Ligand binder design. Structure first.
Ligand SMILES: Cc1cc2nc3c(=O)[nH]c(=O)nc-3n(C[C@H](O)[C@H](O)[C@H](O)COP(=O)(O)OP(=O)(O)OC[C@H]3O[C@@H](n4cnc5c(N)ncnc54)[C@H](O)[C@@H]3O)c2cc1C
Ligand SMILES: O=C(c1ccccn1)N1CCN(C(=O)c2c3c(nc4ccccc24)/C(=C/c2ccco2)CCC3)CC1
Length: 247
């Protein structure tokens, strides 16, 4: 339970990459989320974040936080000010750590992606934190033993309207396309890396992946709004795929 924040990242758009000492009892799956208490902001509140580090990562957890309101802004400050006083001051013995409490892990149906043969992962919006975790572990599982893993093709389609806070995620995807030696991944990005503008024609993306994998079964993992959820379930049923909604 009791731990510390062992680094930060002042990532664009006020986003806060974080490094959290992973307790020896703390073993999580990909996409799992956390409840965190930082006493120096609130002695009382807990707040929830998805872990953005595959559980293959050894002895840290990375949390990409966005300052969007009180505790997250107060959080950002206790960092920039905690960091900016090691630059115009720089008393460099070693860095200290921000004591924080953590509660979890709490699960997601994501663990089923690793069990399925083909797979459509769709993030509409900004719930992309768990998908960064997932897509890393897929990398590691593919490397360490790609025969051991049923997941043979991952189709990733991402819809955001603006990526300023998410320039960290874009990089990470490019990395995945790099070490993706086996062409396990089909990453697509759409704006609402030369990526695609406008709404995707889902009728065709599903019609295409279908042909890619006949007569095998495909599983959809949707993570977005409900009016998109409905369109896809009708496509799932029209090509006989397999649907579930995360969050
Ligand atoms: C499962 C889960 C995973 C999450 N993962 C992440 C993650 O990876 N990264 C991350 O940054 N966050 C994540 N969050 C969100 C995070 O838990 C919250 O943003 C957190 O509580 C910080 O909120 P706050 O108290 O700092 O700001 P708040 O003051 O609570 O801000 C809440 C947001 O709603 C707005 N708002 C709503 N109603 C009003 C109103 N009446 N008046 C004014 N503003 C209003 C605020 O302006 C602000 O945008 C996650 C949440 C969940 C449930
Ligand atoms: O889809 C809905 C929604 C649903 C119903 C009604 C209205 N909106 N939202 C509203 C609630 N959000 C979250 O809590 C949430 C957030 C974030 N990351 C999440 C990851 C997983 C789960 C939630 C979040 C953020 C991540 C981030 C950005 C940059 C760096 O890290 C930013 C803060 C919000 C976002 C999606």
């Amino acid at each position: 339970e009791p731990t510390f924040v062992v680094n930060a990242s002042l990532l664009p758009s006020k986003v806060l990459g974080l490094q959290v000492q992973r307790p020896q009892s703390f073993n999580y799956q990909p996409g799992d989320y956390l409840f965190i208490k930082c006493p120096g902001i609130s002695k009382f509140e807990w707040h929830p974040f998805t872990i953005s580090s595959a559980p293959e990562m050894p002895d840290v957890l990375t949390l990409h936080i966005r300052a969007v309101g009180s505790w997250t802004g107060k959080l950002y400050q206790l960092i920039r000010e905690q960091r900016e006083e090691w630059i115009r001051s720089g008393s460099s013995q070693s860095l200290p750590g921000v004591p924080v409490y953590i509660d979890g892990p709490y699960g997601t149906p994501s663990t089923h992606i690793f069990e399925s043969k083909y797979a459509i992962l769709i993030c509409a919006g900004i719930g992309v934190t768990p998908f960064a975790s997932i897509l890393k572990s897929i990398l590691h599982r593919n490397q360490q033993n790609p025969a051991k893993m049923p997941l043979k093709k991952v189709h990733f389609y991402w819809l955001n309207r603006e990526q300023k806070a998410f320039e960290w995620f874009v990089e990470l995807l490019s990395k995945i396309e790099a070490e993706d030696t086996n062409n396990l991944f089909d990453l697509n990005l759409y704006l609402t890396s030369r990526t695609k503008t406008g709404r995707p024609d889902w009728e065709e993306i599903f019609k295409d992946v279908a042909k890619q994998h006949a007569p095998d079964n495909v599983e959809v993992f949707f993570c977005g709004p409900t009016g998109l959820a409905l369109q896809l379930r009708h496509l799932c049923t029209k090509y006989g795929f397999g649907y579930r909604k995360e969050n």
